[PDB]
Amino acid sequence: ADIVVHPGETVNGGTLVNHDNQFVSGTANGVTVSTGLELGPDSDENTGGQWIKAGGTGRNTTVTANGRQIVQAGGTASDTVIRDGGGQSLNGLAVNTTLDNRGEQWVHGGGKAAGTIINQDGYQTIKHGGLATGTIVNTGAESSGQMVGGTAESTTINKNGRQVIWSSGMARDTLIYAGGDQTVHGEAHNTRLEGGNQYVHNGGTATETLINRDGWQVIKEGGTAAHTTINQKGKLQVNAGGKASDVTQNTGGALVTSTAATVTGTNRLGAFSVVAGKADNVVLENGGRLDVLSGHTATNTRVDDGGTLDIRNGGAATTVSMGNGGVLLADSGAAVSGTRSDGKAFSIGGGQADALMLEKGSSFTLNAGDTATDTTVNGGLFTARGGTLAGTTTLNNGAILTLSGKTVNNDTLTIREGDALLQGGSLTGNGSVEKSGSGTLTVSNTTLTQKAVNLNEGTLTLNDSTVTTDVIAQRGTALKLTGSTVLNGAID
Structure with a gap:
Protein backbone atom coordinates (compact mmCIF):
# COMPACT_ATOMS: atom_id res chain seq x y z
CA ALA A 1 0.00 0.00 0.00
CA LEU A 90 17.06 13.63 8.32
CA ASN A 91 17.89 15.52 5.15
CA GLY A 92 15.37 18.25 5.91
CA LEU A 93 14.32 20.01 9.09
CA ALA A 94 13.19 18.38 12.31
CA VAL A 95 11.92 20.39 15.26
CA ASN A 96 11.45 19.16 18.84
CA THR A 97 12.25 15.52 18.28
CA THR A 98 12.38 13.19 21.29
CA LEU A 99 14.54 10.06 21.31
CA ASP A 100 13.79 7.47 24.00
CA ASN A 101 14.98 3.87 24.40
CA ARG A 102 17.53 3.68 21.58
CA GLY A 103 15.47 5.82 19.22
CA GLU A 104 17.76 7.25 16.58
CA GLN A 105 18.07 10.37 14.50
CA TRP A 106 20.61 10.53 11.69
CA VAL A 107 21.24 14.10 10.61
CA HIS A 108 22.61 13.96 7.06
CA GLY A 109 24.36 16.65 5.02
CA GLY A 110 22.08 19.67 4.79
CA GLY A 111 19.75 18.30 7.43
CA LYS A 112 18.93 20.30 10.54
CA ALA A 113 17.78 18.94 13.92
CA ALA A 114 16.51 21.66 16.23
CA GLY A 115 15.63 20.90 19.86
CA THR A 116 16.18 17.12 19.92
CA ILE A 117 16.01 15.70 23.44
CA ILE A 118 18.01 12.51 23.78
CA ASN A 119 16.76 10.32 26.61
CA GLN A 120 17.56 6.83 27.86
CA ASP A 121 19.99 5.39 25.27
CA GLY A 122 18.65 7.48 22.42
CA TYR A 123 21.23 8.30 19.78
CA GLN A 124 21.60 11.33 17.55
CA THR A 125 24.34 11.20 14.91
CA ILE A 126 25.24 14.34 13.03
CA LYS A 127 27.02 13.42 9.81
CA HIS A 128 29.29 15.70 7.80
CA GLY A 129 27.40 18.83 6.80
CA GLY A 130 24.68 17.99 9.32
CA LEU A 131 23.47 20.52 11.91
CA ALA A 132 21.92 20.23 15.36
CA THR A 133 20.77 23.17 17.46
CA GLY A 134 19.33 23.27 20.96
CA THR A 135 20.13 19.63 21.63
CA ILE A 136 19.42 18.42 25.16
CA VAL A 137 21.56 15.38 25.92
CA ASN A 138 20.29 13.25 28.83
CA THR A 139 22.02 9.97 28.16
CA GLY A 140 25.19 8.31 26.92
CA ALA A 141 27.48 8.74 29.94
CA GLU A 142 25.94 6.03 32.18
CA SER A 143 26.38 3.97 20.91
CA SER A 144 24.19 6.56 22.69
CA GLY A 145 24.09 10.31 23.36
CA GLN A 146 25.07 12.75 20.62
CA MET A 147 27.80 12.15 18.05
CA VAL A 148 29.09 15.12 16.14
CA GLY A 149 30.65 14.63 12.74
CA GLY A 150 29.00 17.79 11.48
CA THR A 151 28.01 20.75 13.63
CA ALA A 152 26.27 21.07 16.98
CA GLU A 153 25.19 24.44 18.35
CA SER A 154 23.70 25.45 21.70
CA THR A 155 23.89 22.04 23.27
CA THR A 156 23.06 21.30 26.88
CA ILE A 157 24.58 18.14 28.32
CA ASN A 158 22.84 17.13 31.54
CA LYS A 159 23.71 14.45 34.10
CA ASN A 160 24.42 11.16 32.29
CA GLY A 161 24.67 12.94 28.94
CA ARG A 162 27.54 12.33 26.54
CA GLN A 163 28.58 14.25 23.44
CA VAL A 164 31.37 12.86 21.27
CA ILE A 165 32.92 15.18 18.71
CA TRP A 166 34.56 13.18 15.95
CA SER A 167 37.75 14.61 14.43
CA SER A 168 35.81 16.25 11.59
CA GLY A 169 33.11 17.53 13.92
CA MET A 170 32.55 20.86 15.62
CA ALA A 171 30.60 21.80 18.75
CA ARG A 172 29.80 25.44 19.42
CA ASP A 173 28.30 26.82 22.66
CA THR A 174 28.01 23.78 24.86
CA LEU A 175 26.73 23.78 28.44
CA ILE A 176 27.83 20.82 30.55
CA TYR A 177 26.42 20.09 34.02
CA ALA A 178 27.70 17.80 36.76
CA GLY A 179 27.71 14.22 35.46
CA GLY A 180 27.83 15.17 31.79
CA ASP A 181 30.80 14.61 29.47
CA GLN A 182 32.07 15.91 26.16
CA THR A 183 34.84 14.01 24.39
CA VAL A 184 36.68 16.08 21.81
CA HIS A 185 38.44 14.53 18.82
CA GLY A 186 37.39 17.45 16.65
CA GLU A 187 36.75 21.05 17.70
CA ALA A 188 34.90 22.46 20.72
CA HIS A 189 34.28 26.21 20.81
CA ASN A 190 32.80 28.01 23.83
CA THR A 191 32.13 25.31 26.38
CA ARG A 192 30.84 26.06 29.84
CA LEU A 193 31.62 23.37 32.38
CA GLU A 194 28.94 23.93 35.01
CA GLY A 195 30.25 21.00 37.05
CA GLY A 196 30.69 18.93 33.90
CA ASN A 197 33.67 17.35 32.16
CA GLN A 198 35.42 17.96 28.87
CA TYR A 199 38.02 15.48 27.58
CA VAL A 200 40.20 16.70 24.76
CA HIS A 201 41.79 13.76 23.02
CA ASN A 202 44.82 13.53 20.75
CA GLY A 203 44.27 15.81 17.73
CA GLY A 204 41.31 17.50 19.41
CA THR A 205 41.11 21.23 20.11
CA ALA A 206 39.02 23.13 22.66
CA THR A 207 38.78 26.92 22.55
CA GLU A 208 37.20 29.14 25.20
CA THR A 209 36.40 26.48 27.76
CA LEU A 210 34.93 28.07 30.86
CA ILE A 211 35.46 25.89 33.92
CA ASN A 212 33.05 26.78 36.69
CA ARG A 213 32.79 25.11 40.09
CA ASP A 214 33.50 21.35 40.05
CA GLY A 215 34.12 21.58 36.31
CA TRP A 216 36.95 19.53 34.89
CA GLN A 217 38.78 20.13 31.60
CA VAL A 218 41.20 17.33 30.71
CA ILE A 219 43.81 17.74 28.00
CA LYS A 220 45.19 14.34 26.99
CA GLU A 221 48.47 13.80 25.17
CA GLY A 222 48.23 15.45 21.75
CA GLY A 223 45.22 17.48 22.82
CA THR A 224 45.12 21.26 22.67
CA ALA A 225 43.29 23.94 24.62
CA ALA A 226 43.37 27.69 24.01
CA HIS A 227 41.66 30.32 26.15
CA THR A 228 40.67 28.29 29.15
CA THR A 229 39.30 30.08 32.17
CA ILE A 230 39.46 28.23 35.46
CA ASN A 231 37.14 29.62 38.09
CA GLN A 232 37.02 28.90 41.80
CA LYS A 233 36.96 25.11 42.39
CA GLY A 234 37.08 24.32 38.68
CA LYS A 235 40.01 22.23 37.53
CA LEU A 236 42.13 22.21 34.42
CA GLN A 237 44.28 19.12 33.98
CA VAL A 238 46.95 18.96 31.27
CA ASN A 239 48.60 15.56 30.86
CA ALA A 240 52.07 14.86 29.57
CA GLY A 241 52.28 15.97 25.93
CA GLY A 242 49.07 17.98 26.22
CA LYS A 243 48.92 21.70 25.52
CA ALA A 244 46.95 24.61 26.99
CA SER A 245 47.67 28.23 26.15
CA ASP A 246 46.07 31.48 27.33
CA VAL A 247 44.89 29.87 30.52
CA THR A 248 43.26 32.44 32.77
CA GLN A 249 43.48 30.86 36.19
CA ASN A 250 41.31 32.78 38.65
CA THR A 251 41.66 32.57 42.42
CA GLY A 252 40.85 29.13 43.73
CA GLY A 253 41.19 27.65 40.27
CA ALA A 254 42.87 24.24 40.25
CA LEU A 255 45.66 23.42 37.79
CA VAL A 256 46.82 19.83 37.61
CA THR A 257 49.83 19.16 35.42
CA SER A 258 53.52 18.29 35.23
CA THR A 259 56.74 19.41 33.60
CA ALA A 260 55.98 17.10 30.68
CA ALA A 261 53.00 19.28 29.66
CA THR A 262 52.72 22.69 28.01
CA VAL A 263 50.67 25.28 29.89
CA THR A 264 50.81 29.08 29.56
CA GLY A 265 48.67 31.90 30.94
CA THR A 266 48.02 34.13 33.93
CA ASN A 267 47.02 33.40 37.48
CA ARG A 268 46.36 35.65 40.45
CA LEU A 269 50.12 36.22 40.70
CA GLY A 270 50.70 37.11 37.06
CA ALA A 271 52.12 35.28 34.06
CA PHE A 272 53.07 31.65 34.54
CA SER A 273 54.29 28.89 32.27
CA VAL A 274 55.12 25.23 32.01
CA VAL A 275 57.21 25.08 28.87
CA ALA A 276 59.83 22.59 27.60
CA GLY A 277 60.35 20.95 30.97
CA LYS A 278 60.40 24.21 32.93
CA ALA A 279 57.71 25.69 35.22
CA ASP A 280 57.53 29.26 36.52
CA ASN A 281 54.99 31.03 38.79
CA VAL A 282 52.65 28.06 39.00
CA VAL A 283 50.00 28.65 41.68
CA LEU A 284 48.59 25.50 43.23
CA GLU A 285 45.42 25.46 45.32
CA ASN A 286 42.06 23.68 45.66
CA GLY A 287 43.19 20.40 44.18
CA GLY A 288 45.87 21.99 42.02
CA ARG A 289 48.99 19.88 41.60
CA LEU A 290 52.34 20.11 39.82
CA ASP A 291 54.60 17.10 39.36
CA VAL A 292 58.21 18.07 38.75
CA LEU A 293 59.72 15.13 36.93
CA SER A 294 63.31 13.94 36.92
CA GLY A 295 65.56 16.40 35.11
CA HIS A 296 63.07 19.25 35.25
CA THR A 297 62.61 22.48 37.13
CA ALA A 298 59.96 24.69 38.72
CA THR A 299 60.61 28.21 40.01
CA ASN A 300 58.35 30.48 42.09
CA THR A 301 55.75 27.80 42.83
CA ARG A 302 53.06 28.93 45.25
CA VAL A 303 51.53 25.99 47.13
CA ASP A 304 48.36 27.01 48.95
CA ASP A 305 45.36 25.48 50.60
CA GLY A 306 44.66 22.20 48.85
CA GLY A 307 47.62 22.59 46.52
CA THR A 308 50.16 19.82 46.00
CA LEU A 309 53.75 20.11 44.79
CA ASP A 310 55.43 16.80 44.02
CA ILE A 311 59.16 16.88 43.30
CA ARG A 312 60.42 13.58 41.96
CA ASN A 313 63.89 12.21 42.37
CA GLY A 314 66.12 14.28 40.11
CA GLY A 315 63.63 17.12 39.89
CA ALA A 316 64.22 20.66 41.08
CA ALA A 317 62.05 23.36 42.58
CA THR A 318 63.27 26.75 43.82
CA THR A 319 61.60 29.67 45.59
CA VAL A 320 58.84 27.27 46.58
CA SER A 321 56.37 29.28 48.62
CA MET A 322 54.49 27.00 51.02
CA GLY A 323 51.22 28.40 52.33
CA ASN A 324 48.71 27.18 54.90
CA GLY A 325 47.12 23.96 53.69
CA GLY A 326 49.87 23.41 51.12
CA VAL A 327 51.20 19.89 50.58
CA LEU A 328 54.76 18.84 49.72
CA LEU A 329 55.94 15.51 48.32
CA ALA A 330 59.70 15.26 47.89
CA ASP A 331 62.63 12.92 48.35
CA SER A 332 66.25 13.45 49.39
CA GLY A 333 67.36 13.02 45.78
CA ALA A 334 65.46 16.17 44.81
CA ALA A 335 66.66 19.77 44.76
CA VAL A 336 64.33 22.14 46.59
CA SER A 337 64.59 25.61 48.09
CA GLY A 338 61.80 27.74 49.50
CA THR A 339 60.03 29.07 52.56
CA ARG A 340 57.52 27.41 54.93
CA SER A 341 54.29 29.06 56.07
CA ASP A 342 56.03 30.26 59.23
CA GLY A 343 58.59 32.12 57.10
CA LYS A 344 61.54 29.80 57.77
CA ALA A 345 63.74 28.65 54.90
CA PHE A 346 64.07 25.03 53.95
CA SER A 347 66.11 23.13 51.41
CA ILE A 348 67.06 19.83 49.88
CA GLY A 349 70.23 19.50 47.81
CA GLY A 350 73.11 17.08 47.31
CA GLY A 351 71.32 14.55 49.51
CA GLN A 352 70.97 17.01 52.41
CA ALA A 353 67.58 18.13 53.71
CA ASP A 354 67.34 21.07 56.06
CA ALA A 355 64.38 22.39 58.03
CA LEU A 356 61.66 20.46 56.19
CA MET A 357 58.22 21.15 57.62
CA LEU A 358 55.84 18.30 56.86
CA GLU A 359 52.17 19.06 57.69
CA LYS A 360 49.30 16.62 57.24
CA GLY A 361 49.35 15.37 53.65
CA SER A 362 53.01 16.14 53.03
CA SER A 363 55.58 13.37 52.73
CA PHE A 364 59.38 13.14 52.47
CA THR A 365 61.47 10.11 51.61
CA LEU A 366 65.03 9.94 52.91
CA ASN A 367 67.19 7.82 50.62
CA ALA A 368 70.10 5.60 51.70
CA GLY A 369 73.26 7.62 52.30
CA ASP A 370 71.41 10.90 52.78
CA THR A 371 70.86 13.24 55.73
CA ALA A 372 67.80 15.13 56.95
CA THR A 373 68.51 17.87 59.48
CA ASP A 374 66.07 19.68 61.76
CA THR A 375 63.00 18.09 60.19
CA THR A 376 59.68 18.89 61.83
CA VAL A 377 56.96 16.37 61.00
CA ASN A 378 53.62 17.76 62.14
CA GLY A 379 50.97 15.26 61.13
CA GLY A 380 52.86 14.38 57.97
CA LEU A 381 54.78 11.31 56.84
CA PHE A 382 58.54 10.78 56.80
CA THR A 383 59.92 7.61 55.26
CA ALA A 384 63.57 6.61 55.51
CA ARG A 385 65.15 3.83 53.45
CA GLY A 386 68.37 4.48 55.35
CA GLY A 387 70.40 7.61 55.94
CA THR A 388 70.76 9.88 58.95
CA LEU A 389 68.49 12.09 61.02
CA ALA A 390 70.33 15.09 62.42
CA GLY A 391 69.78 18.24 64.45
CA THR A 392 66.38 18.16 66.11
CA THR A 393 63.95 15.76 64.43
CA THR A 394 60.46 16.61 65.70
CA LEU A 395 57.43 14.31 65.56
CA ASN A 396 54.11 15.94 66.51
CA ASN A 397 50.35 15.59 66.08
CA GLY A 398 49.87 12.38 64.13
CA ALA A 399 53.36 12.30 62.68
CA ILE A 400 54.51 8.99 61.24
CA LEU A 401 58.16 8.06 60.76
CA THR A 402 58.48 4.86 58.78
CA LEU A 403 61.87 3.13 58.49
CA SER A 404 62.59 0.51 55.82
CA GLY A 405 66.33 0.21 56.40
CA LYS A 406 69.04 1.12 58.88
CA THR A 407 68.70 4.77 59.84
CA VAL A 408 71.06 6.63 62.16
CA ASN A 409 70.38 9.20 64.86
CA ASN A 410 73.11 10.70 67.03
CA ASP A 411 71.22 13.89 67.81
CA THR A 412 67.75 14.58 69.17
CA LEU A 413 64.49 12.90 68.16
CA THR A 414 61.69 14.74 69.96
CA ILE A 415 57.93 14.37 70.40
CA ARG A 416 56.42 17.44 72.02
CA GLU A 417 52.71 17.48 71.21
CA GLY A 418 50.06 14.92 70.23
CA ASP A 419 50.83 11.40 69.07
CA ALA A 420 53.65 9.98 66.98
CA LEU A 421 54.46 6.65 65.32
CA LEU A 422 57.94 5.33 64.66
CA GLN A 423 57.71 2.03 62.84
CA GLY A 424 59.72 -0.55 60.95
CA GLY A 425 63.38 -0.99 60.16
CA SER A 426 66.08 0.13 62.53
CA LEU A 427 67.23 3.31 64.22
CA THR A 428 70.65 3.30 65.89
CA GLY A 429 73.24 5.72 67.23
CA ASN A 430 74.23 7.67 70.32
CA GLY A 431 71.27 9.97 69.98
CA SER A 432 68.44 10.41 72.43
CA VAL A 433 64.65 10.45 72.16
CA GLU A 434 62.65 13.09 74.09
CA LYS A 435 58.97 12.54 74.88
CA SER A 436 56.82 15.35 76.23
CA GLY A 437 53.22 16.46 75.92
CA SER A 438 50.24 14.28 76.85
CA GLY A 439 50.26 12.27 73.63
CA THR A 440 51.54 8.78 72.94
CA LEU A 441 54.75 7.86 71.17
CA THR A 442 54.32 4.40 69.72
CA VAL A 443 57.38 2.49 68.58
CA SER A 444 56.29 -0.47 66.46
CA ASN A 445 58.38 -3.25 64.93
CA THR A 446 61.63 -1.29 65.09
CA THR A 447 65.11 -2.04 66.30
CA LEU A 448 65.71 1.08 68.39
CA THR A 449 69.18 1.66 69.81
CA GLN A 450 69.70 5.04 71.41
CA LYS A 451 71.68 6.41 74.32
CA ALA A 452 68.62 7.44 76.29
CA VAL A 453 64.90 7.93 75.97
CA ASN A 454 63.82 10.89 78.06
CA LEU A 455 60.22 10.05 78.95
CA ASN A 456 59.11 13.39 80.40
CA GLU A 457 55.35 13.37 79.84
CA GLY A 458 52.62 11.14 78.44
CA THR A 459 52.86 7.61 77.10
CA LEU A 460 55.64 5.65 75.43
CA THR A 461 54.49 2.39 73.90
CA LEU A 462 57.02 -0.12 72.66
CA ASN A 463 55.27 -2.68 70.50
CA ASP A 464 57.02 -5.65 68.82
CA SER A 465 60.37 -3.82 69.12
CA THR A 466 63.92 -4.65 70.14
CA VAL A 467 64.92 -1.63 72.18
CA THR A 468 68.36 -0.92 73.62
CA THR A 469 68.54 2.29 75.68
CA ASP A 470 68.10 3.84 79.11
CA VAL A 471 64.51 4.91 79.60
CA ILE A 472 64.62 7.87 81.97
CA ALA A 473 61.08 8.56 83.23
CA GLN A 474 59.48 11.34 85.22
CA ARG A 475 56.11 11.83 86.88
CA GLY A 476 53.11 12.17 84.58
CA THR A 477 54.19 9.29 82.35
CA ALA A 478 53.39 5.72 81.40
CA LEU A 479 55.61 3.18 79.69
CA LYS A 480 54.06 0.20 77.95
CA LEU A 481 55.83 -2.88 76.63
CA THR A 482 53.54 -4.83 74.31
CA GLY A 483 53.84 -7.74 71.91
CA SER A 484 57.26 -9.30 71.39
CA THR A 485 59.17 -6.30 72.73
CA VAL A 486 62.53 -6.88 74.42
CA LEU A 487 64.20 -4.05 76.32
CA ASN A 488 67.86 -3.61 77.25
CA GLY A 489 68.42 -2.91 79.87
CA ALA A 490 66.91 -0.64 82.53
CA ILE A 491 64.77 2.34 83.54
CA ASP A 492 65.77 5.24 85.78
Missing part, protein backbone atom coordinates in the same frame (compact mmCIF):
# COMPACT_ATOMS: atom_id res chain seq x y z
CA ASP A 2 1.23 3.49 -0.98
CA ILE A 3 -0.72 6.34 0.66
CA VAL A 4 -0.08 9.72 -0.93
CA VAL A 5 -0.78 13.02 0.81
CA HIS A 6 -0.91 15.87 -1.70
CA PRO A 7 -0.11 19.55 -1.13
CA GLY A 8 -3.10 21.18 0.58
CA GLU A 9 -4.20 17.86 2.04
CA THR A 10 -4.02 16.93 5.73
CA VAL A 11 -4.47 13.38 7.04
CA ASN A 12 -4.73 12.15 10.63
CA GLY A 13 -3.66 8.97 12.39
CA GLY A 14 -3.07 5.53 10.93
CA THR A 15 -0.29 3.01 11.39
CA LEU A 16 2.26 2.12 8.73
CA VAL A 17 3.13 -1.57 8.74
CA ASN A 18 4.45 -4.26 6.38
CA HIS A 19 6.62 -2.01 4.22
CA ASP A 20 3.81 0.46 3.46
CA ASN A 21 5.03 3.83 2.27
CA GLN A 22 3.33 7.12 3.02
CA PHE A 23 4.53 9.91 0.76
CA VAL A 24 3.69 13.25 2.32
CA SER A 25 3.68 16.41 0.26
CA GLY A 26 0.96 17.90 2.43
CA THR A 27 0.56 17.34 6.14
CA ALA A 28 0.42 14.02 7.95
CA ASN A 29 -0.50 14.30 11.63
CA GLY A 30 -0.21 11.67 14.33
CA VAL A 31 0.80 8.77 12.13
CA THR A 32 2.39 5.79 13.92
CA VAL A 33 5.27 4.46 11.82
CA SER A 34 6.18 0.83 12.49
CA THR A 35 7.90 -0.18 9.29
CA GLY A 36 10.86 0.87 7.14
CA LEU A 37 13.71 -0.10 9.46
CA GLU A 38 13.10 -3.87 9.72
CA LEU A 39 16.64 -4.55 8.48
CA GLY A 40 18.21 -1.87 10.64
CA PRO A 41 20.20 1.27 9.83
CA ASP A 42 23.22 -0.56 8.36
CA SER A 43 21.23 -2.16 5.57
CA ASP A 44 20.26 -0.39 2.37
CA GLU A 45 17.52 -2.88 1.53
CA ASN A 46 14.80 -1.46 3.82
CA THR A 47 11.44 -0.56 2.28
CA GLY A 48 8.49 1.38 3.65
CA GLY A 49 8.11 4.29 6.06
CA GLN A 50 6.81 7.84 6.18
CA TRP A 51 8.54 9.99 3.57
CA ILE A 52 8.15 13.68 4.25
CA LYS A 53 8.90 15.20 0.88
CA ALA A 54 9.90 18.69 -0.21
CA GLY A 55 7.29 21.11 1.12
CA GLY A 56 5.62 18.40 3.19
CA THR A 57 5.15 18.33 6.94
CA GLY A 58 5.06 15.45 9.41
CA ARG A 59 3.55 16.32 12.81
CA ASN A 60 3.31 14.20 15.93
CA THR A 61 4.68 11.14 14.22
CA THR A 62 5.45 8.28 16.58
CA VAL A 63 8.21 6.05 15.25
CA THR A 64 8.40 2.60 16.84
CA ALA A 65 10.93 -0.27 16.79
CA ASN A 66 10.87 -1.11 13.07
CA GLY A 67 9.74 2.35 12.04
CA ARG A 68 11.58 4.70 9.73
CA GLN A 69 10.68 8.34 9.08
CA ILE A 70 12.54 9.87 6.15
CA VAL A 71 12.58 13.63 6.15
CA GLN A 72 13.81 14.71 2.77
CA ALA A 73 15.43 17.99 1.87
CA GLY A 74 12.71 20.65 1.96
CA GLY A 75 10.70 18.46 4.30
CA THR A 76 9.75 19.32 7.86
CA ALA A 77 9.10 17.11 10.88
CA SER A 78 7.69 18.42 14.11
CA ASP A 79 7.06 16.82 17.55
CA THR A 80 8.41 13.46 16.50
CA VAL A 81 8.65 10.73 19.12
CA ILE A 82 11.17 8.04 18.20
CA ARG A 83 11.47 5.04 20.49
CA ASP A 84 12.63 1.44 20.80
CA GLY A 85 15.29 1.62 18.11
CA GLY A 86 13.09 3.33 15.53
CA GLY A 87 14.80 5.95 13.42
CA GLN A 88 14.43 9.20 11.52
CA SER A 89 16.68 9.89 8.51
